Amino acid sequence: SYLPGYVPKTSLSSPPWPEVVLPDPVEETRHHAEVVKKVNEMIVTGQYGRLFAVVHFASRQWKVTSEDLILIGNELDLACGERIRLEKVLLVGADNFTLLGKPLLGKDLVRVEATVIEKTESWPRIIMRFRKRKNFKKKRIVTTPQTVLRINSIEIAPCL
Amino acid sequence: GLDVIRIRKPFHTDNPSIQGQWHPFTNKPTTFRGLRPREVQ
Amino acid sequence: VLADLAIYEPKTFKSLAALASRRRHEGFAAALGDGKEPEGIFSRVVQYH
Amino acid sequence: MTGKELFEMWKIINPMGLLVEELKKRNVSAPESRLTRQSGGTTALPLYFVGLYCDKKLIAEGPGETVLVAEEEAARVALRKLYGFTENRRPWNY
Amino acid sequence: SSFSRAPQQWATFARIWYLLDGKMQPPGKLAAMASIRLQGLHKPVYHALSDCGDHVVIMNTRHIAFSGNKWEQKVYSSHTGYPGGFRQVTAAQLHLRDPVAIVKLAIYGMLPKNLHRRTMMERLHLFPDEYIPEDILKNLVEELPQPRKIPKRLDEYTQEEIDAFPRLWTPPEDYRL
Amino acid sequence: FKNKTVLKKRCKDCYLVKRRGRWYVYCKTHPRHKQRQM
Amino acid sequence: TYSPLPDDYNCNVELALTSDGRTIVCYHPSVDIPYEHTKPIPRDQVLKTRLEEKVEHLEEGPMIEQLSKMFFTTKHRWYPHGRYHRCRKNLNPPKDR
RNA sequence: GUAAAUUUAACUGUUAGUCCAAAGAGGAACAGCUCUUUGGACACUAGGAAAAAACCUUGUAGAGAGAGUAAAAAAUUUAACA
Ligand SMILES: [Mg+2]
Ligand SMILES: [Zn+2]
């Protein structure tokens, strides 16, 4: 007995993409709790090494690790050799697991530590404007201030 | 003391990868007995 | 940073691709259902105030 | 010491010999080299991933332009993993 | 990965010998995926100055298929520069003369128009039939999936799907047919 | 044949046939009625 | 029974969401190449075994076409360059990691 | 709603003009034609329409190895008649 809505199996009676069934919500939330608890006990025991992070800083996103260097294109009103905490951590990850913020991770969960090690200027940049047959010719030299930060440590805490 | 010249690549890490740098055979499945395509065995 | 993860962290990029594909399947399921089913685990939006 | 590799600081000659000695003294069967992955092979730019297996279980993998150098690199990777000098190890605490 | 620097670099930048089949495939789709693989645009480590191309071995190029009437419509035009060198051959005539010229020309068109195109075309390998030389066969890795689906003519439908497909109309009993 | 854009039957014996991608008026009894669409 | 991606080439990926729903926890242990998926490793009576040292000197055309056939390039890579480019080349390039 | 306007003082330079949309005039209800009027743009930047003055998008200036966008890719296949 054919259902009122049956189509015979032709080339395009059915969608080309395979049918995808999604798991039921209750079993999926239990599975999420199990996976989160597993990753949490990995964090507790310490089965990780050489964490990396994606950190929002100075309108850019830097993929930093420990013992790293980054060059910020502005002055940071800090003395040299000064230890600061980078906070807007978009991502932290290791081998075998990563943690993803929505869009930012918890400050209790992850810390990034950086150190102002250099306050410098950039090499001179030339701005020249030339429009022809109109005697239009203009030159300028700019030197953008810069700050070199060394990323010291990336630490995570068991809070999932 | 370093030169005020052009700095390529405004970041410097010595350990760029932790999960292993991509090679072509990353994200490629293995085959029974490692057979090449159209191997007569 | 997405290209950086693609080159140097293939497992983190695979996890991101799996998350994106799972969100796609949630979107297709919601559009197909068209009713008031549960919104999905990863289709939830964290609101800020 | 920060940015350098173990066999960049400590030069060795026979990583396969060191590996079989370590596995013998920690009571592990002798490793077997197998061709996990292979590209080219007849050309002037081949690619060989050789895997070192122990009791049918992978312990190391290594790339090379020839089979012998791939096997040597796999031995070095095995030594690294067994000794704790892996690239993704925990960084030094300052 | 804990590789040494030189083996790690070699493993990242090594070349792969992809395999591809003709046999009722459209040469434009063949040429699109072959062009991606020849440029190296399938690699996340791609850069135009990094020479990251791969070898592509296309076989059964004699059995390609054109959608529509392209076998008679499509014209390949060339000019031997002597006055009167203007030659225009249809796609049928070009396929009958050279079994690999159509796929070669399609890939040559889709490759970028710079000085790297000839190097990429040297890494391209085309064979009209099932025969491949032995060294290339021992080089091959990853037969790629075909773009088309080979629409499966009437006589190789098995009886199970034949009688699973329902009957749409009842004919009169006195019709000759 | 005569090249025409509009084809017109001039007899009761003329017939329109589409051959080699073009319409034709063929007449067996009056061969002057042969017309070729262009 | 559902996986967003096939789980047999890089890592066994499992996605999870924390109880507050504020962060996404990914677990991806690497996959290992199976032993059965691998392949086993490839393998004058009276005088010396005199070392077979012949080096035939090919002229430029044959040498370049042999190199081009070997490395799958064109001839233009193998043709030489002038003193202007040779002395413009930087012989002490900068080196990062 | 906004912040400019008039007057007073002192002068230069521009006063050989192009296309587009609209209302017209002359010519052939020709012209990358000529003549007025209203309005744009160009003679200043950038992105698009293939190249590109005049069409479309967009203007106020720098550094960035960040992000959201604007305009932005042509579709069509036709003749049986008792
Ligand atoms: Mg004019
Ligand atoms: Zn007639």
User: Do the Cβ atoms of A154 and A51 come closer than 8 Å?
Assistant: yes
Minimal CA–CA distance to B16: which of E1, E127, A101? E1
CA dist., res. G71 & res. E53, Å (int): 12
CA distance D55 to D76: 19
What b/e sequence results for A3-15 when a residue is b if at least 16 CB atoms lie within 10 Å of its CB, and e otherwise?
A: eeeeeeeeeeeee
DSSP H helices in chain D: 6-9, 15-25, 67-83
Q: Report the distance separating Cα G4 and Cα G24, nearest Å.
A: 15
CB atoms < 10 A from the CB of D28, how many? 15
Burial G33-51 (b: 16+ CB within 10 A, else e): bbeebbbeeeeeeeeeeee
Q: How far apart are CA E107 and CA E55, in angstroms?
A: 13
DSSP G21: S
A40 touches strand H (CB under 7 A): no
Do the Cβ atoms of A90 and A110 come closer than 8 Å?
no
Distance A136 CA to ligand 1 centre (A): 30
* Residue–nucleotide distance: A134 CA to H25 C1' (Å): 39
Nearest to D40 by CA among E138, E52, B35: E138
Phi, psi torsion values for D25, nearest 5 degrees: -80, -15
Give Cα separations from E21 to A66, A116, E103, E116, E160 (angstroms). 48, 58, 12, 25, 30
Domains in chain E, start-ordered, CATH in brackets? 1-177 (3.90.1180.10)
Q: How far is E165 from chain A (nearest CA, A)?
A: 6
Nearest to D39 by CA among E111, E57, E126: E57
Looking at residue A84, what DSSP letter applies? Answer: E
CA-to-CA distance for B19 and C7, rounded, in angstroms? Answer: 10
Which among B21, G5, G17 is positioned nearest to A39, based on CA atoms?
G17
Per residue in G65-96, is it b (16+ CB within 10 Å) or e — as a string?
eeebeeebbbeeeeeeeeeeeeeeeeeeeeee
Which method, experimentally, gave rise to this model? cryo-EM
Contact G28/C42 with Cβ under 8 angstroms?
Answer: no
Locate the chain B residue with the closest alpha carbon to C11: B19
Phi, psi of E137 (to 5 degrees): -60, -40
Please list, in sequence order, all residues whose beta carbon lies within 8 angstroms of the beta carbon of residue E136, skipping any fewer than 6 positions away.
E17, E57, E125
Rounded Cα distance between D87 and D84, Å, is 9
d(CA D34, CA B7) in angstroms, rounded, equals 45
What is the torsional sign of CA E94, E96, E100, E103? positive
Range list of H helices, A2-137? 25-45
Report the C-alpha dihedral over residues G66, G70, G74, G77, rounded to 10 degrees: -90
| CA torsion, ordered E21, E24, E29, E34, to nearest 10 deg | 20
Query: In this structure, how many other beta carbons lie within 10 angstroms of the beta carbon of residue E2?
Result: 22
G85: enclosing H helix or E strand: helix G83-88
B23 within 8 A of D63, measured Cβ to Cβ: yes
Query: In this structure, is the CB of residue A145 within 7 Å of any atom belonging to strand H?
Result: no
CB pair distance less than 8 Å for A54 and C1: yes
DSSP category for residue G30: B
Fill in the DSSP letter of residue E102. H
DSSP annotation of B33 reads G
Six token digits for residue C11: 């497992």
Q: How far is the CA of A134 from the centre of ligand 1 (A)?
A: 25
**G70 CA, H36 C1': Å apart:** 78
Residue pointed to by tokens 């805490």:
A157
Contact partners, residue E119, CB within 8 Å, separation at least 6: E51, E53, G72, G73, G74, G77
Q: Are E18 and E144 in contact (CB under 8 A)?
A: yes
- Amino acid E11 reads A
d(CA G79, CA B33): 44
Residues contacting A121, CB < 8 A, separation 6+: A143, A144, A145, A146, B4
Distance, CA of A80 to CA of B7 (rounded, Å): 20
Q: Does the nearest atom of strand H lie within 7 Å of F27's Cβ? A: no
Q: How far apart are CA A39 and CA A99, in angstroms?
A: 10
| Residue D49, CA atoms < 13 Å, CB-side half-sphere | 22
| Segment (H or E) for A67 | none
Residue E147: count other Cβ atoms within 10 Å of its Cβ.
13
Task: Give the containing element (helix H, strand E) for A71.
Answer: strand A68-72
DSSP 3-state assignment of C36?
A: coil
- β-bridge mates for residue A113, sequence order: A85, A153
Q: What does the alpha-carbon distance between residue F8 and residue G27 come to, in Å, rounded to a whole number? A: 79
**Secondary structure (3-state) at D70:** helix
Q: How far out from the chain centre does Cα G37 lie?
A: 22
Q: How far is CA G30 from the centre of its chain?
A: 22
Q: Nearest Cα to E53, choosing from E43, E44, E61?
A: E43
Q: Measure the CA–CA gap between E62 and E43, rounded to whole angstroms.
A: 30
Q: How far apart are CA E123 and CA E18, in angstroms?
A: 11
Q: Which amino acid belongs to residue G2? A: Y
**Quick one: tokens of A24?**
């039921």
Structure tokens at A70: 């980054």
Strands E17-21 vs E55-59: parallel, antiparallel or unpaired: parallel
Rounded Cα distance between D20 and D26, Å, is 10
Q: Which helix (H) or strand (E) holds E135?
A: helix E134-139
Q: Which SS3 state, helix, strand or coil, does residue E120 take?
A: helix
Nearest CA to E30 among E68, E56, E55, E69? E56
Q: In this structure, are residues D50 and D35 in contact, taking their beta carbons and an 8 Å threshold? A: yes
H-helix or E-strand spanning residue A101: strand A96-101
Nearest to E104 by CA among E87, E115, E117: E117
- CB A88 within 8 Å of CB A57: yes
Provide the edge-to-edge strand list for the sheet that holds A60-65.
A60-65, A52-57, A89-93, A96-101, G23-28, G14-17
Distances E133 to E21, E59, E139 between C-alpha atoms, Å: 15, 11, 10
Burial of D55 (0-12, 13-18, 19+ CB in 10 A): exposed
Asked if residue F38 keeps its beta carbon closer than 7 A to nucleic acid strand H, the reply is: no
Residue G63: half-sphere exposure toward Cβ, Cα within 13 Å: 10
Chains that touch A (3 or more CB pairs under 8 A): B, C, D, E, G
- For chain E, which residues lie within 8 Å of any Cβ of chain A, measuring from their own Cβ? 151, 161, 164-166
CA distances in angstroms from A62 to A51, A95, D30, listed in the order given: 14, 19, 44
Who's near E172: CB < 8 A, 6+ residues apart?
none
Determine if the peptide bond prior to G62 is cis (ω within 30°): no
> Which chain G residues have a beta carbon less than 8 Å from that of E118?
74
Which range marks the domain in which residue D24 is found?
Answer: 14-88
Backbone angles phi, psi at A99, to 5 degrees: -115, 135
> CA-based Rg of chain B, rounded to a whole angstrom?
21
Those residues with Cβ within 8 angstroms of residue A36's Cβ, 6 or more apart along the chain or in another chain = A160, G16, G17, G18, G19, G25
Angle between helices E101-110 and E27-39 (to 10 degrees): 50
CB-based burial, B1-39: b 16+ in 10 Å, e otherwise: eeeeeebeeebbbebbbbbbbbbbbbbeebeeebebbee
Neighbours of D91 (CB within 10 A): 17
Question: Do residues E64 and E34 lie in contact, with contact meaning Cβ atoms separated by under 8 Å?
Answer: no
Least CB–CB distance from A61: residue in C1, C9, C15: C1
| DSSP state letters, E23-82 | SS--HHHHHHHHHHHHHTTTSTT--TTS----EEEEE-GGG---STTHHHH-EEEEE-SS
Strand locations in chain F (E)? 2-4, 14-19, 22-27, 35-37
Residue with tokens 């075309």: E121
Contact G28, A96 (CB under 8 A): yes
Q: Which of the nucleotides lies closest to F5 (Cα–C1')?
A: H79
Closest CA to G72 of E20, E53, E130, E37: E53
* Strand H, nucleotides covered by protein (CB < 7 Å): 43-45, 62-66, 79-81
Rg of chain E taking only CA atoms, in angstroms? 22
**Minimum-distance nucleotide, CA of A144 to C1':** H63
Closest by Cα among D48, D45, D52, D41 to D67: D48
Beta-ladder partners of D45: none
Q: What Å resolution does this PDB entry report?
A: 3.1
Contacts from A59-62 at CB under 8 Å and sequence distance 24+? A61/A90, A61/C1, A62/B11, A62/C1
Report the alpha-carbon distance of residue E101 to residue C46 in Å, rounded. Answer: 57
Round to whole Å and give the CA distance between E164 and B11.
Answer: 64
User: Closest approach of chain G CAs to the CA of C41, in angstroms?
Assistant: 8
Nearest CA in chain A to B11: A70
* Cα gap A152→A83, rounded to integer Å: 9
In this complex, the nucleotide whose C1' atom is nearest to the CA atom of residue A61 is H66
Q: What is the DSSP letter of C10?
A: H
Pairwise CB contact (< 8 Å): E138 & B36: yes
Q: How far, in whole angstroms, is CA A73 from its chain's centroid?
A: 19
Helix (H, G, I), strand (E, B) or coil at D80: helix
CB under 8 A, 24+ apart: contacts of A130-134:
none
- Rounded Cα–Cα distance for residues E9 and E16 (Å): 15
**Helix, strand or coil, per DSSP, at residue A125:** strand
Which residues of B lie closer than 8 Å to G, measured between beta carbons?
A: 8-9, 12-14, 16, 19, 26-34
- Cβ atoms of E31 and E103 closer than 8 Å: yes
Q: Are strands F35-37 and A82-86 parallel, antiparallel or unpaired?
A: unpaired
Burial of D13 (0-12, 13-18, 19+ CB in 10 A): exposed
Nearest nt by C1' to A146 Cα: H63
Q: Which ligand is nearest to the CA of F15?
A: 2
Angle (CA) D8 G97 C7, round 5°: 110
| End-to-end CA gap in chain C | 28
Q: Which residue has the tokens 């010719």?
A: A137
Residue length, chain E?
177
Q: Rounded CA gap, D85 and D6, in Å? A: 7
CB E41 within 8 A of CB E108: no
Ligand 1 centroid – CA A135 distance (Å): 29
- Give, as one character, the DSSP assignment of residue E15: -
